[PDB]
Amino acid sequence: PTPQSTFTGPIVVDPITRIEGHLRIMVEVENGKVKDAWSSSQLFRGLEIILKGRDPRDAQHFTQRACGVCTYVHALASSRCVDDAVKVSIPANARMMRNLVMASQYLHDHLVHFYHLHALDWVDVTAALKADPNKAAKLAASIAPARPGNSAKALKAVQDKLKAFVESGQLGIFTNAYFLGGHKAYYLPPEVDLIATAHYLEALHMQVKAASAMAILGGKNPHTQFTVVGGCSNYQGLTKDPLANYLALSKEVCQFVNECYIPDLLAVAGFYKDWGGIGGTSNYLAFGEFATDDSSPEKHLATSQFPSGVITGRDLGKVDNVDLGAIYEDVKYSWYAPGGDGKHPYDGVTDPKYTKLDDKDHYSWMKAPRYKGKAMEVGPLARTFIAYAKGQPDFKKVVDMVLGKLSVPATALHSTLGRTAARGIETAIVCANMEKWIKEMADSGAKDNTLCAKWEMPEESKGVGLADAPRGALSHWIRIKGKKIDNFQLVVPSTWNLGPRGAQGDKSPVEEALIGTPIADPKRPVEILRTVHAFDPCIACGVH
Amino acid sequence: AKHRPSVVWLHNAECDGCTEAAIRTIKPYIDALILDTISLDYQETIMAAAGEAAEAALHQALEGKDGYYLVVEGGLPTIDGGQWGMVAGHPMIETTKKAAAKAKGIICIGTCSAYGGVQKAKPNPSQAKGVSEALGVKTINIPGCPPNPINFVGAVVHVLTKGIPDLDENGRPKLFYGELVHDNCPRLPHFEASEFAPSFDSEEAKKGFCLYELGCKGPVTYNNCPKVLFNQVNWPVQAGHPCLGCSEPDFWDTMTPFYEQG
Numbered sequence: 136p137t138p139q140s141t142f143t144g145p146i147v148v149d150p151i152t153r154i155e156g157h158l159r160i161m162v163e164v165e166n167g168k169v170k171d172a173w174s175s176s177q178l179f180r181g182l183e184i185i186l187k188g189r190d191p192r193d194a195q196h197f198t199q200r201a202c203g204v205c206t207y208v209h210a211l212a213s214s215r216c217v218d219d220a221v222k223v224s225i226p227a228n229a230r231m232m233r234n235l236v237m238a239s240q241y242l243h244d245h246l247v248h249f250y251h252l253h254a255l256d257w258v259d260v261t262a263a264l265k266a267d268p269n270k271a272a273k274l275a276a277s278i279a280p281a282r283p284g285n286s287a288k289a290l291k292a293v294q295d296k297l298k299a300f301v302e303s304g305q306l307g308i309f310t311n312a313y314f315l316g317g318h319k320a321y322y323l324p325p326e327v328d329l330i331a332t333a334h335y336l337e338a339l340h341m342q343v344k345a346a347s348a349m350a351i352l353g354g355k356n357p358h359t360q361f362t363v364v365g366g367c368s369n370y371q372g373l374t375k376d377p378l379a380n381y382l383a384l385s386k387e388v389c390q391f392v393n394e395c396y397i398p399d400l401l402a403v404a405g406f407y408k409d410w411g412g413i414g415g416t417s418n419y420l421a422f423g424e425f426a427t428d429d430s431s432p433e434k435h436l437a438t439s440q441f442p443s444g445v446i447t448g449r450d451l452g453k454v455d456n457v458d459l460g461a462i463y464e465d466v467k468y469s470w471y472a473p474g475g476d477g478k479h480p481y482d483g484v485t486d487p488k489y490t491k492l493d494d495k496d497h498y499s500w501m502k503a504p505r506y507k508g509k510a511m512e513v514g515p516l517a518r519t520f521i522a523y524a525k526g527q528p529d530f531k532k533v534v535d536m537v538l539g540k541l542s543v544p545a546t547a548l549h550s551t552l553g554r555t556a557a558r559g560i561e562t563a564i565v566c567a568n569m570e571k572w573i574k575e576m577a578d579s580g581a582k583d584n585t586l587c588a589k590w591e592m593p594e595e596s597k598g599v600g601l602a603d604a605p606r607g608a609l610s611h612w613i614r615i616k617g618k619k620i621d622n623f624q625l626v627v628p629s630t631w632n633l634g635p636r637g638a639q640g641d642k643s644p645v646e647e648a649l650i651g652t653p654i655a656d657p658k659r660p661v662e663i664l665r666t667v668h669a670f671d672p673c674i675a676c677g678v679h
Numbered sequence: 680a681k682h683r684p685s686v687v688w689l690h691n692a693e694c695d696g697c698t699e700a701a702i703r704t705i706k707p708y709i710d711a712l713i714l715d716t717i718s719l720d721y722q723e724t725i726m727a728a729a730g731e732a733a734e735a736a737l738h739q740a741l742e743g744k745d746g747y748y749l750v751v752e753g754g755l756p757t758i759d760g761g762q763w764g765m766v767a768g769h770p771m772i773e774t775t776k777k778a779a780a781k782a783k784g785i786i787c788i789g790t791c792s793a794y795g796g797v798q799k800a801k802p803n804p805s806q807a808k809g810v811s812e813a814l815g816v817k818t819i820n821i822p823g824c825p826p827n828p829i830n831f832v833g834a835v836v837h838v839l840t841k842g843i844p845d846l847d848e849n850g851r852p853k854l855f856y857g858e859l860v861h862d863n864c865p866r867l868p869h870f871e872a873s874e875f876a877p878s879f880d881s882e883e884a885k886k887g888f889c890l891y892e893l894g895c896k897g898p899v900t901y902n903n904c905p906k907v908l909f910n911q912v913n914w915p916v917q918a919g920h921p922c923l924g925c926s927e928p929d930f931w932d933t934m935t936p937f938y939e940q941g
């Protein structure tokens with residue numbers, strides 16, 4: 136069964152590495168199981184404060200620097216947000232281009248997350264040195280598609296490289312890893328550790344391609360520069376040769392996703408089947424993404440091809456519409472002035488007030504977003520559940536493949552395992568749609584290259600931009616007064632997932648998901664990392 | 680086994696865009712860099728250890744007998760004794776100051792670490808500062824938001840194999856920051872001809888006219904963007920958008936409004 140110690144007492148992990156930004160996790164463990172948790176974000180920058188009084192056109196350039204991992208997504212949300220506030224409807228080509236850049240961002244972001252941020256919680260790199268390369272080539276012939284990168288010679292080469300590295304005594308990013316010396320919670324055979332390590336190195340190259348693709352439309356990566364109020368500026372992105380390259384690089388990236396990412400995820404999933412019973416939560420929210428009609432937030436919600444919705448208490452039979460007026464943020468357990476609870480983002484207040492480390496009454500720089508009193512998990516798993524409940528064809532098919540391959544029930548997805556698997560599920564779906572989306576923009580662009588609509592700055596207005604970013608439901612909310620920013624609030628997926636307790640004392644998703652975590656070895660609490668990482672935390676996103 | 684120079688990488692008030700940028704390097708790729716060229720001994724985004732294990736790994740690097748180079752990503756928040764930016768329970772300013780004391784060299788990756796960056800923009804609630812300001816020591820600045828990896832990796836390799844490259848008044852290596860964006864821009868002919876796009880929807884825009892009247896800060900921004908491109912494919916002006924001046928100190932405040940020249 137699942138390794139578990141008898142440990143009783145506190146554990147603090149700070150820093151949580153292999154996330155974006157600065158997170159401290161505190162838990163109380165009892166008989167080797169986490170019984171309480173706190174998600175403590177450790178950095179404040181204050182973009183909302185900074186934006187006050189500025190040109191609304193400037194908002195996207197400031198907010199995109201909320202985060203460089205989920206680069207673009209903030210500039211998109213801001214641009215949606217201001218387009219709404221000025222009541223401009225962007226041209227079809229701009230909808231297409233904006234959505235394709237989001238797709239490219241998913242591909243890049245998710246590949247890097249699985250391999251470079253998450254996989255070291257499940258793969259013991261050093262144990263790959265124990266593997267036989269022939270035995271690993273054979274095993275790879277049986278967990279994934281044939282490919283030259285998986286041949287014995289290729290796997291020996293990775294092994295030799297890794298061996299010379301480890302024997303140098305300069306372990307670098309592997310220094311003091313939780314798997315050094317063996318670890319009870321690490322289950323893979325050395326043959327699988329070799330394969331995953333091989334792909335880890337391959338992924339470091341492949342992400343450069345994924346970014347290149349994105350930069351064809353986005354201008355550069357990180358931090359795109361192609362969006363403007365009323366649409367996009369990139370006329371050249373509607374043209375043949377740049378699109379042909381965009382398609383070609385996107386096919387190489389998608390080949391890697393299907394050849395390596397998904398089989399790697401599924402193998403890990405089969406070995407760590409027990410994690411289908413750890414780390415689940417109950418409520419899921421998505422604003423949807425990839426809409427065919429982005430003329431308004433209402434149209435976005437309704438026509439997102441990855442649908443929007445609300446699931447509560449794991450009830451897949453009642454997917455509710457999103458009520459954008461029902462969202463608010465608490466600050467009772469956050470480092471902000473009293474008086475800030477229960478604020479709809481249009482009425483949002485960011486008044487920073489630090490107390491001290493591990494003050495149980497105020498222990499995070501994130502606000503606590505709630506939905507009618509309830510915490511909501513956001514991200515791939517939420518999107519997946521909502522899409523599956525609504526019989527979205529592509530989600531149905533691919534979820535079913537997974538459950539059929541893993542031989543587990545759909546209920547098994549409410550877990551850290553499912554959270555991990557959902558990420559890959561939706562990557563394979565975006566991949567399946569790239570050629571269709573590309574061909575729709577190439578044809579459209581060729582027929583008429585309109586890319587930005589005329590608009591007017593109002594003296595007074597308000598507006599909201601919605602996106603489902605790689606980590607979930609993102610909204611930006613503006614109040615314009617005197618043709619300037621009167622208030623601008625970000626509510627970000629990581630705020631939903633990793634914020635602190637709300638005004639009622641109620642745990643956030645990550646804090647609830649940590650309840651019941653087994654700790655095999657309190658000195659090396661990899662299980663905390665597995666769950667935290669499965670949420671794909673971004674603290675710079677979270678706090679802004 | 681040939682020894683590889685230790686590099687310690689710290690993350691302060693940052694967005695991780697500079698880490699993300701660095702791993703876009705292709706000459707060489709990041710794996711070859713860290714397997715063959717440097718010993719990357721602490722890097723929060725990708726390192727295997729977490730918590731006390733990670734802190735220990737930092738401590739080991741800072742006490743390595745061969746010394747180490749320091750890369751800093753992010754500005755330093757200084758309000759309330761530095762406590763608005765903490766790692767492992769310590770103010771970011773205190774750890775950076777500690778790491779800098781014995782560094783062979785300090786490279787600031789990005790406008791944030793170089794100059795203070797986005798968190799320092801008015802009204803600067805965290806009282807963020809650049810590294811050179813906060814520590815009182817000279818730094819090698821590789822600004823941009825983020826900088827091109829060609830620039831950062833080239834600096835790193837230059838520092839480890841040749842010495843400190845020549846730096847301008849703002850601490851930037853002249854090899855990459857010696858020229859104005861505008862001087863190498865393909866639109867320059869339009870600019871000399873006063874052929875400006877009045878708006879993004881205009882026929883002028885569609886024809887690739889100069890983006891000056893739309894706020895382009897190319898004319899006053901030192902960077903190599905049009906010469907080397909980003910991601911081997913593009914740069915902002917080629918994508919039809921004005922330069923924000925993102926490699927200039929305090930550009931958040933000196934180059935805004937972004938869509939104007941006023």
Ligand code: SF4
Pocket residue numbers: 200203692693694695696697752753788789790791792796797823824825826
């Ligand atoms: S310089 Fe820009 S990209 Fe780099 S950390 Fe700062 S905000 Fe992020």
Ligand code: SF4
Pocket residue numbers: 860861862864865866867868870888889890891895896897898916921922
């Ligand atoms: S677009 Fe910008 S950099 Fe290019 S010529 Fe015009 S002002 Fe100069």
Ligand code: FCO
Pocket residue numbers: 202205208209604605606607609627628629630672673676677
């Ligand atoms: N994806 C992403 Fe970043 C977070 N959380 C944003 O928005």
Ligand code: F3S
Pocket residue numbers: 823824860900902904914915916921922923924925926
């Ligand atoms: S915005 Fe920055 S990346 Fe280059 S084009 Fe301007 S200096």
Ligand SMILES: [Mg+2]
Pocket residue numbers: 183502624625626627678679
């Ligand atoms: Mg906010």
Ligand code: NI
Pocket residue numbers: 155201202203204205206673675676
């Ligand atoms: Ni992010």
